[PDB]
């Protein structure tokens with residue numbers, strides 16, 4: 001039955017707009033298959049269109065905003081794009097239709113509407129780009145009855161082992177198509193829908209904009225060798241309308257040109273299913289998809305006071321939709337240094353110098369290919385998977401569709417190598433590599449990342465103790481399925497546990513350190529003088545200089561999170577010997593946290609080093625790090641140490657801002673210094689952790705109930721309002737919020753862990 005619930009998920013999820021890197025495109029969860037992408041641009045001039053054309057997501061003064069208003073990966077949704085440069089408000093309605101044995105059929109409505117500043121008669125080029133990768137597959141454009149283009153529909157007929165037979169229809173569409181007077185309309189026609197059919201070697205079909213512009217150049221060079229001159233040049237649009245050449249290939253460019261408002265549909269009909277898909281199908285399924293989304297939101301995300309008003313429901317739907325609508329499918333080789341050079345051991349003072357020499361041998365090589373099905377931090381800036389980001393992404397996704405979140409966890413853990421390592425940044429394929437500077441491509445098998453995917457497993461387990469809607473909850477509804485999922489994954493979770501203990505180990509034994517355990521001590525590998533990228537808190541102040549004897553309370557707390565989950569998962573599977581060993585490790589962690597990381601002087605936890613004189617020092621930097629035992633849920637509700645930390649959290653002179661908890665105390669000597677990334681600003685992911693724990697230390701008998709209820713109430717309000725205000729004014733979720741102003745700053749479209757607020761608004765954790 002697990003395979004059956006499993007075969008039903010593959011089929012539900014196969015098709016999607018799973019190319020979050022571009023404004024709108026589709027691909028299935030198959031490495032080498034059929035991909036679509038939308039391009040458009042105003043043409044007012046002979047040279048402008050190369051600058052106005054839109055394909056891959058950016059965020060600059062020329063784009064007001066874009067995002068999904070509703071989305072569910074199983075059904076589809078509606079995307080709005082607000083393009084200032086091109087005077088357009090574009091709508092992408094996308095919807096799926098189950099049927100057949102090939103993950104079904106789908107359709108999309110592209111709707112463009114000039115804004116009030118657009119020339120009422122603006123000319124707008126729209127391209128629909130279709131490519132097919134694969135060895136024994138065919139795609140052909142049926143030619144048109146008309147002489148130099150198509151008057152009505154465009155029919156692509158194709159077949160693959162993976163998809164079998166399908167047809168892809170780009171419709172005539174409503175909207176004024178402009179005609180030309182000029183001599184040139186003897187050879188190209190007056191103006192019509194046109195199709196070019198090409199072949200390139202599979203590995204370049206992703207480079208749609210260069211492929212398009214190679215055909216626009218050819219057809220411009222062709223005017224110049226046919227004596228068409230500056231005396232009487234044709235209109236810019238006609239110069240940039242392609243010569244119809246429909247045929248068979250792995251690339252089909254379908255070009256329309258429109259005067260004023262316009263709209264056309266894409267209907268992909270799977271031959272495995274019955275009747276072909278129609279625009280009447282599109283309108284029915286979209287209306288239906290909207291009611292369903294509406295009903296599911298109101299149940300899954302019941303916004304509690306003071307946020308029950310419609311304005312907050314709207315904001316909630318935006319944050320949630322953009323988070324889940326970022327889901328992408330990624331396929332290709334990764335770049336990995338597999339030397340495991342001895343300098344990566346970092347066992348010498350000045351180890352950062354040694355590790356740079358090793359990197360400077362550039363031994364890294366492409367390996368794979370791999371697949372990842374994951375949400376992303378940001379479409380314009382980070383259209384790829386980040387390991388500890390996804391743990392936060394999936395908390396709200398799991399609530400909506402636990403079966404989807406478990407598909408994504410599975411996808412991530414299938415990347416785990418034999419030693420237990422998952423690269424913290426998944427850059428799969430050339431398409432992914434193009435958005436990434438050459439210096440950040442190389443992954444390093446000693447580089448860890450917080451294991452937040454365990455927190456999603458925690459929520460999965462608590463909901464286990466206690467048709468598309470049937471599928472979404474099947475792995476909790478049918479407990480035999482959940483168990484089987486956890487049984488298959490468990491050995492991976494354990495392999496990663498051991499990988500942290502082998503690769504990220506602190507040195508207790510070799511220094512003058514007294515502790516309750518000689519085993520439990522951790523140090524983040526990968527840190528430079530200013531940075532610790534592997535912890536996720538890029539520039540949070542750590543011991544200076546970096547040193548093999550450093551110990552990292554945030555790493556120790558994450559191991560803690562892992563063990564609590566391994567004990568819980570192990571108990572369910574009956575791993576009785578393993579559970580006994582976990583309970584010993586947990587115990588030792590609780591004690592060593594105190595014996596190595598607690599500052600009675602400063603009333604918080606701290607990273608440790610060893611002195612210029614070879615003895616253990618605590619290095620205390622009041623902020624997110626200082627609270628990690630608490631944030632990760634390891635302190636007992638009556639701990640005197642919890643009491644001391646709650647003080648710190650509520651202390652307006654240290655971490656309490658009107659807009660949320662500051663990354664670093666105002667009182668710390670590194671507050672607002674250097675790139676000031678994790679050195680003052682408000683981060684929603686850590687604020688989320690603080691809030692969840694406060695609600696927990698507030699819903700139990702104990703001495704901090706009342707204190708922790710005030711803090712929960714206020715921190716909940718401050719964070720939600722900060723993110724709502726900014727969403728009202730800018731239309732964006734942001735990576736961080738300014739602690740002096742509550743202004744969103746740095747990365748935009750951060751949905752992303754900023755979308756964590758939707759969960760914060762509904763409460764009941």
Ligand SMILES: Cc1cc(NCc2cccc(CN3C[C@H](O)[C@@H](O)[C@H](O)[C@H]3CO)n2)cc(-c2ccc[nH]2)c1
Nearest residue numbers: 377381382386388389437440535536537538735747
């Ligand atoms: C490629 C690049 C990076 C950076 N700065 C680093 C950077 C910025 C934004 C997001 C992140 C990723 N974040 C960082 C978070 O700290 C992680 O916790 C989290 O996992 C992760 C994913 O969300 N890194 C600056 C430039 C630049 C070019 C020109 C001027 N500047 C270019």
Ligand SMILES: Cc1cc(NCc2cccc(CN3C[C@H](O)[C@@H](O)[C@H](O)[C@H]3CO)n2)cc(-c2ccc[nH]2)c1
Nearest residue numbers: 058380381382435437538675677735745746747748
């Ligand atoms: C004030 C501020 C804004 C942003 N914005 C998002 C962002 C993210 C990553 C890379 C870039 C760089 N550039 C800027 C170029 O103009 C783009 O064309 C180009 O695509 C893009 C990506 O390379 N921007 C990030 C930071 C930041 C965080 C950490 C260190 N710095 C600070």
